[PDB]
Design a protein around this ligand. Sequence first.
Ligand SMILES: [Ca+2]
Ligand SMILES: [Ca+2]
Length: 76
Amino acid sequence: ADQLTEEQIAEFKEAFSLFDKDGDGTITTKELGTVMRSLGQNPTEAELQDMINEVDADGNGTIDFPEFLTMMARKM
Ligand SMILES: [Ca+2]
Ligand SMILES: [Ca+2]
């Protein structure tokens, strides 16, 4: 288990699906709203822009699964 057991990791994969509902391979900022919100939270518009950028490794302005996982490492 790197991050966590295959369970938690697997769920992170599922969470990814929940994020990228379109399956475009790209979590958008607006989608981030949905994302954080879906986990049962309430982000501000700023939080969408900022939450992405804070965990954007490429500086592109989008989040993928790999980046999500690194973010997940921060989630602790
Ligand atoms: Ca998307
Ligand atoms: Ca990115």
